[PDB]
Amino acid sequence: KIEEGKLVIWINGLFGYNGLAEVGKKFEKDTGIKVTVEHPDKLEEKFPQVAATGDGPDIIFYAHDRFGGYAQSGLLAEITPDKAFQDKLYPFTWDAVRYNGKLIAYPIAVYALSLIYNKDLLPNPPKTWEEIPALDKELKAKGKSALMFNLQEPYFTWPLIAADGGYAFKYENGKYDIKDVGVDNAGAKAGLTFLVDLIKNKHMNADTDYSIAEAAFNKGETAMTINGPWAWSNIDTSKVNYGVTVLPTFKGQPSKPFVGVLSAGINAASPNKELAKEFLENYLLTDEGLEAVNKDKPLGAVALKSYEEELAKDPRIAATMENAQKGEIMPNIPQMSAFWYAVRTAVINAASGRQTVDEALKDAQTRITK
Numbered sequence: 001k002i003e004e005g006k007l008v009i010w011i012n013g014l015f016g017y018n019g020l021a022e023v024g025k026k027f028e029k030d031t032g033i034k035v036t037v038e039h040p041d042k043l044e045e046k047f048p049q050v051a052a053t054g055d056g057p058d059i060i061f062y063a064h065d066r067f068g069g070y071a072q073s074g075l076l077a078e079i080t081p082d083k084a085f086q087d088k089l090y091p092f093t094w095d096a097v098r099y100n101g102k103l104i105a106y107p108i109a110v111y112a113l114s115l116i117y118n119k120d121l122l123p124n125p126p127k128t129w130e131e132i133p134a135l136d137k138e139l140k141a142k143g144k145s146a147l148m149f150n151l152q153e154p155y156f157t158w159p160l161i162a163a164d165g166g167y168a169f170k171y172e173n174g175k176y177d178i179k180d181v182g183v184d185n186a187g188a189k190a191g192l193t194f195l196v197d198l199i200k201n202k203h204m205n206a207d208t209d210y211s212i213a214e215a216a217f218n219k220g221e222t223a224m225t226i227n228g229p230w231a232w233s234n235i236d237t238s239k240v241n242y243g244v245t246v247l248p249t250f251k252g253q254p255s256k257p258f259v260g261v262l263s264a265g266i267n268a269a270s271p272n273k274e275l276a277k278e279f280l281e282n283y284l285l286t287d288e289g290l291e292a293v294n295k296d297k298p299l300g301a302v303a304l305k306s307y308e309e310e311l312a313k314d315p316r317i318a319a320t321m322e323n324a325q326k327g328e329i330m331p332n333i334p335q336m337s338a339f340w341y342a343v344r345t346a347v348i349n350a351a352s353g354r355q356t357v358d359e360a361l362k363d364a365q366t367r368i369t370k
Contacts, residue, residue, distance in 0.1 A: 001054075001055075001271075002054075002055060002056065002057075002058060002267065002269055002270050002271060002272070004271040004272060005033065005272070006033055006034045006035070006036070006058075006272070007024070007027075007033065007034070007035045007036070007058045007059065007272055007275055007276060007279060008036050008038065008057040008058050008059075009024070009035065009036065009037045009038065009057055009058065009059045009060075009061070010038055010039070010040060010043055010046075010047065010056070010057040010059070010060050010061065011037065011038075011039055011043075011060075011061035012039060012043055012044075012061065012062075013039040013041075014297075015061065015262070015293075015297055015299075016293040016294070016295075016296035016297030016298075016299070017037050017039050017296075018296050019292045019293040019294070019295060019296025019297065020037050020284070020292070020293050020296075021035075021037045022292045022296075023035075023279075023283050023284050023289045023292050023293065024036070024037055024279075026283060026288075026289075026292075027279050027283050031275075031278075033275060035279065038057070043060075043062075044062065047060050047062075047070070047075070048069075048070065048073065048075065051070070051073075051075040051267055051268070051269065052073065052075070054269040055269070056267050056269070057267060058266065058267055058270040058272045058273075058275070058276050059264055059265070059266055059267070059270075059276050059279070059280070060076075060264070060265050060267065061108070061262060061263070061264050061265075062262075062263060062265070063260055063261075063262065063263070064096045064097050064105065064107070064260060064261045064262075064263040064330070064332060065260065065330050065331075065332050065336070066096075066260065066330055066331070066332040066336070067331075067332050067333060067334050067336055067337065068099040068100070068332040068333050068334070069334060070104075070265065071099035071100070071102075071104045071332070072099070072334065074268055075265075075267070075268055076104040076105060076265040076266060076267070076268055077104070077265075077266040077267065077268045077270070077273055078102045078103060078104060079103045079104065079105065079106060079266065079277065080277065081103070081106070081277075081281060085281055085285075088285070088304060088305060088306065089107055089285075089303045089304055089305065090107075090110070090303055090305060090308075090325070092259065092324070092325065092329060093107035093110060093261055093303035094107065095171070095174070095329050096259065096260070096261040096263070096329050096330070096332075097261065097263050098174050099332060100174075100175060101173065101174035101175055102174075104265060105263035105264055105265040105266075106263060106264045106265075106280045106281070106285065107261045107262075107263055107303035108261070108262045108263060108264055108284070108285070108290075108299070108302065108303060109261065109262035109299040109300055109301065109302055109303070110259065110260075110261055110300070110301040110302060110303055110320070110321065110324050111228055111229065111259065111260040111261065111262075111300065111301070111320075111324070112228070112257045112258075112259050112260075112301075112320055112321075112323040112324035112327050113155075113156065113159060113226050113227060113228050113247065113257040113323060114226070114227075114228070114244045114245065114246070114247060114257075114316070114319045114320055114322075114323050115224060115226060115244070115245050115246065115247050115248065115319075116217065116224065116225050116226065116227055116231070116235070116242055116243070116244050117223060117224045117242060117243050117244075117245065118217070118220060118222075118223050118224070118240050118241070118242055119241045119242060119243050120220075120240070120241055121139065121144060121220070121223040122135070122139075122146075122223040122224065125224065125243070125245055125248075126248050127246075127248060127249060128248050128249050128250070129160060129163075129194060129248045129249070129250040129255070130250070131248075132146055132147055132198070132203065132248070133198065133201060133203055135223075136203040139223055144220075144221060144222065144223060145203075145204075145216070145221065145222045145223070146203065146222070146223050146224060147203070147204065147222060147223065147224045147225065147226075148204070148208055148212070148213040148216045148217065148221075148222040148224075148225055149208070149213050149224075149225050149226035149227070150208065150209050150210040150213055150226075151195075151199075151204065151205075151206060151207075151208050151209070151347070151351060152208075152209045152210070152344075152348070153210075153344065154340060154343040154344045154347055155258060156226060157192075157195060157347050158256075158257065158258055158328075158343075159226070159247055159255035159256055159257040159327075160191045160192075160194065160195055160250055160255055161187075161188050161191035161192050161195070161347075162187070162188070162191065162255070162256040162257075162328055163187070163191055163249065163250035163251065163253050163254065163255045163256055164186070164187035164188075164190045164191055164250055164251045164253050165182065165185055165186060165187015165188065165190075165253075166182050166183060166185060166187045166188030166191060167181075167182035167183075167328060168181065168182065168183070168328065168330075168331050168336065168339050169181060169182075169331050169333070169335065169336075169339075170182070171329070171331075176331050176333050176335075178333065178335045178369070179369065181339075181365055181368045181369050183339075183342070183343060183346075183361055183364050183365045183368060184358075184361040184362050184364065184365035188361055189357055189358060189361055190250075190251065191250060192346075192347065192350055192357045192360070192361060193357045194250065195347075195350075195351070196350050196351060196357055199351055206351040206352055213225050213227075214227075214231065214234065217235070217240070217242075218234075218235060218236040218239065218240065219236075219239065220239055220240055226247070228300075228320075229298075229300030229301070229316070229317075229320055230300075232244075232316060243315065243316075244315060244316035244319045244320070245315075245319050246319055246322050246323055246326075247323055247326075254326040255323075255326070256326060256327050256328045257323055257324075257326075257327045257328070258327060258328055258329075258330040259324045259327040259328060259329050259330060260330050261303065262299070264280055264284070266280075285303075285304050286304075287304070287306055287307045287310065290302055290304060290307045291307070294311075300317060300320055301317050301320040301321045301324060308321060335368070338367065338368050338370070339368050342363075342364040342365075342367040342368050343364050345360075345363075345364065346360040346361055346363065346364035347360070
């Protein structure tokens with residue numbers, strides 16, 4: 001039986017748990033209720049096991065995807081924020097924590113890819129994907145490349161494939177329709193064709209992965225890369241003066257990166273649901289609460305409007321939120337498993353020449369809607 005009268009919180013060690021513990025100390029000073037923060041190893045596997053038996057922490061911090069299967073198994077309590085509180089967070093973040101039409105977690109941090117560029121090689125980054133080939137030719141005259149990013153994972157190539165019309169699943173009535181998949185439509189084909197053309201024209205290499213691109217950008221060999229907030233800390237500022245901006249448009253449409261959110265859910269078996277709501281809404285999700293966590297380990301962009309407006313003074317964060325608002329919420333349904341593997345295979349096969357773009361996407365589409 002989860003202990004009544006206190007709050008136990010589980011979060012991954014990658015986040016600012018020491019800072020969250022500080023918010024917990026404030027809560028105890030105001031209410032007399034003790035808050036304990038833990039970061040167990042293999043948390044994503046441990047929570048489902050303990051919660052299934054009605055045990056575990058009162059609050060669990062994870063990724064919203066994010067397949068609805070903590071929610072699918074009913075491990076999370078439906079949350080009850082009033083309208084005044086809902087108005088305090090960006091609308092799209094609430095969509096990220098809704099499963100089958102019901103809110104099952106509080107959005108904390110917001111993640112989306114952005115365009116990272118070297119200010120010394122490219123003082124003015126391209127606003128369009130279409131101008132990259134010409135830019136690469138000019139930079140290659142100096143032994144540099146225009147753009148290098150991970151082409152092995154769909155997460156990184158999706159922004160371009162979705163720009164002119166591609167999408168995972170149609171979202172209607174706070175619910176995903178697995179019968180309407182947008183992987184082989186005109187937009188997706190146009191985007192993947194452009195990516196493949198970049199490779200056939202030698203502007204990019206099909207074998208480029210995360211580490212190769214990161215090293216290239218860090219050594220000043222490439223003018224641009226595409227990555228998320230998690231990568232900023234590893235950029236070699238002793239060699240590179242970088243900027244972060246909105247992703248380029250394709251066919252005049254904004255690139256649409258998948259948008260993810262760090263979410264805080266309440267254990268369906270907790271006898272402290274009201275205390276948990278009080279802590280999350282009135283302590284953590286306040287300018288003071290987020291700052292405490294942020295000062296420990298930066299969150300990047302956040303769902304709370306008032307604090308994001310403050311954080312946005314950092315152009316890298318401003319860019320992250322701009323791309324997030326133009327992006328596609330990452331679906332949290334079980335069918336997403338099929339999407340990731342099918343699209344990964346399609347992009348790899350199209351880039352390698354093993355399959356044409358049209359056939360690669362048709363096969364992925366057919367596999368997903370199976």
